[PDB]
Homo-oligomer: A and B are copies of this chain.
Amino acid sequence: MRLEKDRFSVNLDVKHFSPEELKVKVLGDVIEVHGKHEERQDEHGFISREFHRKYRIPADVDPLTITSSLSSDGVLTVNGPRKQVSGPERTIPIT
């Protein structure tokens, strides 16, 4: 949902939502994310919002190392580091 020269961040507005109702997850290359709230006809134009978003990590981002926080105003945040890594400037053979 967002990238930086040193870190990254996925942001989702899911206001009036609460953690027990959501599922974050890391399946290697991907970042799973499931939601589902049944506040029911209580609202007005009732909303039974459920889903399942998935994102692709970036290469220099470790599949582990993920701060998955949240703010008071119902906003899922997913964090992680970047690594410049070291490969000798590898001159590639063009056929």
Contacts and interface: CB of A to CB of B under 8 A. Distances in A.
A29 B82 CA distance: 10
Interface residues of A, number: 36
Nearest to A64: B90
Given A95-B68, A95-B70, A90 B60 contact: no
Contacts of A64: 87, 90
Interface string A42-65: 000000000000001111110110
Nearest to A82: B29
Contact of A92 (B25, B61, B87, B92): B25
Contacts of A85: 28-29, 63
Given A25-B92, A27-B87, A89-B27, A58 B56 contact: yes
